[PDB]
Amino acid sequence: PQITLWKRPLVTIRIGGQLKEALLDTGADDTVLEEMNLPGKWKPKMIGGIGGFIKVRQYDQIPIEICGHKAIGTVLVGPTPVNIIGRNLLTQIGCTLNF
Amino acid sequence: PQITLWKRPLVTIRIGGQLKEALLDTGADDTVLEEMNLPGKWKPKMIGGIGGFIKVRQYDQIPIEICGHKAIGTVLVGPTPVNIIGRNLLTQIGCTLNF
Numbered sequence: 553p554q555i556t557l558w559k560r561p562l563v564t565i566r567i568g569g570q571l572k573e574a575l576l577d578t579g580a581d582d583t584v585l586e587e588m589n590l591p592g593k594w595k596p597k598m599i600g601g602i603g604g605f606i607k608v609r610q611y612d613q614i615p616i617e618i619c620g621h622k623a624i625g626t627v628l629v630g631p632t633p634v635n636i637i638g639r640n641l642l643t644q645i646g647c648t649l650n651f
Numbered sequence: 652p653q654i655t656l657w658k659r660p661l662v663t664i665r666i667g668g669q670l671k672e673a674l675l676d677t678g679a680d681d682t683v684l685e686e687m688n689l690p691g692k693w694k695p696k697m698i699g700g701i702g703g704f705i706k707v708r709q710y711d712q713i714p715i716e717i718c719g720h721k722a723i724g725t726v727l728v729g730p731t732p733v734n735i736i737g738r739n740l741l742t743q744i745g746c747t748l749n750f
């Protein structure tokens with residue numbers, strides 16, 4: 553699809569057996585999901601945003617389908633106000649910026 | 652151009668006659684640049700994301716050339732981690748997300 557940027561580029565994603573709305577975010581190196589109780593091992597991480605840093609749980613090799621396109625990779629989970637699909641997954645679904 | 656996402660989508664901008672490197676950030680509502688001088692009146696504003704809010708200076712109707720494309724719009728200036736081109740200007744330059 554083509555997504556214009558008049559509004560937030562929110563799309564439906566499928567992860568760990570939930571459908572979620574998530575921002576396709578070219579400014580995000582990593583994918584950051586709102587708090588959710590994913591199974592499996594994780595590693596602690598701190599990521600820096602506009603207001604400072606938050607602590608997140610890093611889960612590896614998590615399947616995520618982004619409206620139709622399958623990806624698998626690292627997902628960070630923590631107290632973000634929005635689900636963020638970052639470049640690690642955007643590259644996998646062949647997402648580009650175009651102008 | 653078409654810009655892939657295996658690297659940060661950093662582009663050269665020209666603003667107030669100065670060249671800077673800024674991140675094309677579809678997850679950002681607004682454009683916020685690191686502390687710098689810009690001509691004209693500004694008003695205090697606060698903007699937020701992960702880690703909470705920061706105080707910025709809002710400059711309206713500021714010309715910025717982004718990767719050779721002209722925009723004129725709101726530029727926020729403050730303690731952002733990186734120079735960010737947000738949707739307010741990405742829309743002006745005709746930027747879309749495609750996959």
Ligand SMILES: CC[C@H](C)CN(C[C@@H](O)[C@H](Cc1ccccc1)NC(=O)[C@@H](NC(C)=O)[C@@H](C)CC)S(=O)(=O)c1ccc2ncsc2c1
Binds near residue numbers: 583683
């Ligand atoms: C490169 C620095 C950048 C800040 C990283 N983040 C991604 C960014 O697009 C966020 C997304 C966002 C939107 C709304 C609420 C909260 C966040 N936008 C924002 O924080 C913007 N907020 C809004 C409301 O658009 C602000 C810029 C104000 C306009 S980020 O979200 O802080 C982020 C994401 C992934 C990641 N991986 C490693 S460090 C890292 C940091």
